[PDB]
């Protein structure tokens, strides 16, 4: 059961399938985020709290999007850009990825506070958007992108250079994978699910038109977020378990799990694509603001 | 770095029970950033495997080169 | 009995006006060359208002201006450096007019409260206090102007105008004779006569000293919203809600000529002239502002910079810049 | 150049003050009052120059109420100043079906109230503004309905002369005037002698309106 | 009713002039002050406060 197999089979699919999807995501995300950011910039009236949250989300999505071409270059042939750029890209990727989800969690909390405590909560709704956001979304990311700074070095494998993180004693990998799983889906996921479920609970029996539309929207948001981010973390968990020798099987199972992870993460990188559509282009106020900014 | 395109060196969890008499072919993979991997084909089923170099036979083979 | 006599007198007036009409302005102004298209670019934008803006008035030094909004704040700006000089809170947040004294000492404000508040700016304490409150009207204030530091003229919604006396706080003269609400008022350069335009589509020329009406001009089909004199004081221009402007004549006692276009169907909220009386500014309802020609009736420029209805407009004494305030809570200066 | 520094400091101070005042003022509730027959200001003022402004608080919420029955000018010329209010409280007297207008006996008073409500509800300025409706004189209507059948005002009505279905018919007729069914809602309440449920109903209506406004501000729909 | 008749009678006997003369006077006034008008002829930026 210790016979070694080679990852060349996965490399054959990874060389061709990945960069095209990355290019499509890059184009669509850059177009959407540019439209959103120019609409926000050309607005002269006082910005609401949701406008501030959308401005943070757009900045995070832009930071994530400007990273894809480097990974496309890495996947297609090899690495060329040197140690400094390798480390900088590694640093940017993590902060963008974690901010893009903590912003969603904070938006869900803000909407809960606005819908449930509508008459009373008006000052906390501003405190959570002016002071707590920085101690919220950004400080954990800037404090957890430290492993990339400590150790992320380019190295020669076969003929090609590679920008990959290298771990001492092959444990760091499992502990960091558990960290990724926990931060990605369990810190913001619980808050989002609870707040949106109770909002749906408080907007179910009403017979209004606007209330019905809001109920449909919250369901769409929950379904989109969970369908985007669940299978990727399931695959990561399976890979961590098989690496931790809890599951003892042949390496064809390893190949299948790697294929699953690759396809599912390629699918899940559409969060930067879908966020401007879900959070900006489905609102009447933002539509009116964009129409005014057009002329 | 996305997990999909990360680097994984092949031989993991080497054993220390392979006998010297079962060795049929000798080959060592040249791969850095991991523990040294030697893929020697066995004689029982002609299947390669990576084992740790702490074995007395492995130490003698290393010292005889 | 009296109705027949009044009809006969009106017929005689119409016959005399028709007889006095020998030629129109457009026939004898065709000699002059038309003015080129006016390209006006905004210079400053003033922000700080949180609600609709209903009036404004340039100072006599062409640097300071005052704006009134529904939020209950009367803001005195500084147009040169965008800095705000004063922000006076209001007792009532329903305001529809404001004015700036010729000497820069006092300001005025009025609205749905039927009380004209006069505030003193330059006090010993260096702040603003209520200098006087004028009461006695039975309708909402629509416009108020300062003849001097002591006398103020107001036009109310009960078909009346009043010449007040700030020192005593009591009315001095009352001008009646209209039919509908009075929604405009402008003082002549010599500050001896003023015209008023009411809802009955009739503009009346009053007499401050005598206290009696002198001339009445008709020709409009809807409510008159704005009025202003020619810089020489010999003629004036009226704007109504039926998307038209008209130029009358005091001496000829007859309408001169009209400004209209086939693509305009929204009413006028404010009109103004230039220093030489050549360019006529008109703020229409459709978020726009037009620059007509006082002698050719040809459009020569559009000032499109607002996201909502334009409610007030003004031109400095030297004609350097024009300030427009809209319902978007922004004042914009063009030059 | 100390004058420039002082001017900038003064501008910053009186900009922060205005921002704070606006933030404070955005947290309160404003209501307009309307009525056709008796100006609709009798019951609510006691129950709690040209305009009347009334402040009251209930369960930590500040309500201002604007009464504009002292303005006898044309309604078209000053109603746009009230665009953006939270709600309009319309008062209708139930004991006016058998009465006639003071000016002329041809038009019934409740028909004039219906016309005024139709004009207010379908105005171009008030499209997103909700209407709370009060039906007063419930006991007097109770007494009057038995003596005078509800047929002088509604000839097409076909029902027994009892309070419940007559009141339901009146409420249905008043609510049916609305044409913007998908943008605004009308809350109907019969005022009671106990001056403790009217303010609760107003509080509930204002809370619902605020929730529906926040549903749009947050961008959910 | 008598007040309106009296006002009409009082305002009926006033002096009037030909429309052509007034139009010529307006044209002359407009032409006289065409040299000093910052809106008609834009002022160079050296002396422009804005
Ligand atoms: C990698 C990181 C540290 C780069 C800097 C990113 C963070 C710190 C930047 C990116 C976009 C920035 C925001 C852009 C817009 C606004 C709106 C403004 O009204 C207040 C500041 C605020 C909210 C900024 C705060 C700082 C911000 C969130």
Curated annotation (Swiss-Prot), chain A:
Post-translational modification: Phosphorylated on agonist stimulation. Rapidly phosphorylated on serine and threonine residues in the C-terminal.
Important for signaling (motif): residue ranges: 110-112
GO terms of molecular function: actin binding; C-C chemokine binding; C-C chemokine receptor activity; C-X-C chemokine receptor activity; C-X-C motif chemokine 12 receptor activity; coreceptor activity; G protein-coupled receptor activity; myosin light chain binding
Effect of residue 170 to R: Abolishes coreceptor activity for HIV-1 isolate NDK. Reduced coreceptor activity for several other HIV-1 isolates
Side of membrane Cytoplasmic, spans: 41-54, 108-131, 194-218
Region (Chemokine binding): 71-74, 90-94
Known glycosylation sites: 153
Mutagenesis / variant outcome for changing residue 287 to R: No effect on ubiquitination by RNF113A
Stretches of the chain found on the membrane's Extracellular side: 77-87, 152-172, 239-259
UniProt free text on domains: The amino-terminus is critical for ligand binding. Residues in all four extracellular regions contribute to HIV-1 coreceptor activity.
Family: Belongs to the G-protein coupled receptor 1 family.
Note: Plerixafor (AMD3100), an antagonist of CXCR4 activity, blocks HIV-1 entry, interaction with CXCL12 and subsequent CXCR4 signaling.
Protein name, per record: C-X-C chemokine receptor type 4
Species this chain originates from: Homo sapiens
Organism phylogeny: Eukaryota, Metazoa, Chordata, Craniata, Vertebrata
Section of the entire sequence shown: 24 to 318 of 352
UniProtKB/Swiss-Prot annotation, chain B:
Effect of residue 48 to N: Slightly impaired CXCR4 activation and clear resistance to inhibition by heparin
Span(s) of short sequence motif Receptor activation motif: 1-2
Site, as annotated: Important for dimer formation: 25
Known outcome of mutating residue 39 to A: Impaired CXCR4 activation
Effect of substituting residue 49 to A: Impaired CXCR4 activation
Disulfide links within the chain: 9-34, 11-50
Annotated effect of mutating residue 25 to A: Reduced dimerization in neutral pH. Eliminates the pH dependence of dimerization
Effect upon mutating residue 16 to A: No effect on anti-HIV-1 and chemotactic activities
Site (Important for integrin interaction and activation): 24, 27, 43
Record protein name field: SDF-1-alpha(3-67)
Species of the source: Homo sapiens
Lineage of source species: Eukaryota, Metazoa, Chordata, Craniata, Vertebrata
From Swiss-Prot, chain C:
WD repeat extents: 41-89, 90-135, 136-176, 177-218, 219-262, 263-304, 305-335
Source organism, top-level taxon: Eukaryota
InterPro entries according to UniProt: G-protein_beta_WD-40_rep (IPR020472), Gprotein_B (IPR001632), Guanine_nucleotide-bd_bsu (IPR016346), WD40/YVTN_repeat-like_dom_sf (IPR015943), WD40_repeat_CS (IPR019775), WD40_repeat_dom_sf (IPR036322), WD40_rpt (IPR001680)
Effect of residue 332 to Q: In MRD42; uncertain significance; no effect on protein abundance; no effect on complex formation with gamma subunit; no effect on trimer formation with alpha and gamma subunits; no effect on receptor-driven G protein activation
GO biological process terms held by the UniProt record: adenylate cyclase-activating dopamine receptor signaling pathway; cell population proliferation; cellular response to catecholamine stimulus; cellular response to prostaglandin E stimulus; G protein-coupled acetylcholine receptor signaling pathway; G protein-coupled receptor signaling pathway; phospholipase C-activating G protein-coupled receptor signaling pathway; Ras protein signal transduction
PTM characteristics: Phosphorylation at His-261 by NDKB contributes to G protein activation by increasing the high energetic phosphate transfer onto GDP.
Residue positions where Phosphohistidine is found in the record: 261
Pfam families, alphabetized: WD40_Gbeta
Consequence recorded when altering residue 75 to T: In MRD42; also found in patient with hematologic malignancies; reduces interaction with GNAI2, GNAI3, GNA13 and GNA11; induces activation of PI3K-AKT-mTOR and MAPK pathways
From Swiss-Prot, chain E:
Coiled-coil regions listed in the entry: none
Single annotated GO MF: G-protein beta-subunit binding
Acetylation is among the record's keywords: yes
Subcellular locations according to the entry: Cell membrane
Keywords assigned: Acetylation, Cell membrane, Host-virus interaction, Lipoprotein, Membrane, Methylation, Prenylation, Transducer
One GO term (biological process): fibroblast proliferation
Domain of life according to the entry: Eukaryota
Any one GO cellular component localisation term in the record: membrane
Membrane topology: Lipid-anchor
Keyword Cell membrane: yes
Tissue expression remark: Expressed in fetal tissues, including testis, adrenal gland, brain, white blood cells and brain.
Functional note: Guanine nucleotide-binding proteins (G proteins) are involved as a modulator or transducer in various transmembrane signaling systems. The beta and gamma chains are required for the GTPase activity, for replacement of GDP by GTP, and for G protein-effector interaction.
Similarity annotation: Belongs to the G protein gamma family.
Assembly: G proteins are composed of 3 units, alpha, beta and gamma. In this context, interacts with GNB2. The heterodimer formed by GNB1 and GNG2 interacts with ARHGEF5. The heterodimer formed by GNB1 and GNG2 interacts with GRK2. Forms complexes with TAS2R14 and G-proteins; these complexes play a role in the perception of bitterness. Component of the TAS2R14-GNAI1 complex, consisting of TAS2R14, GNAI1, GNB1 and GNG2. Component of the TAS2R14-GNAT3 complex, consisting of TAS2R14, GNAT3, GNB1 and GNG2. Component of the TAS2R14-GNAS2 complex, consisting of TAS2R14, GNAS2, GNB1 and GNG2.
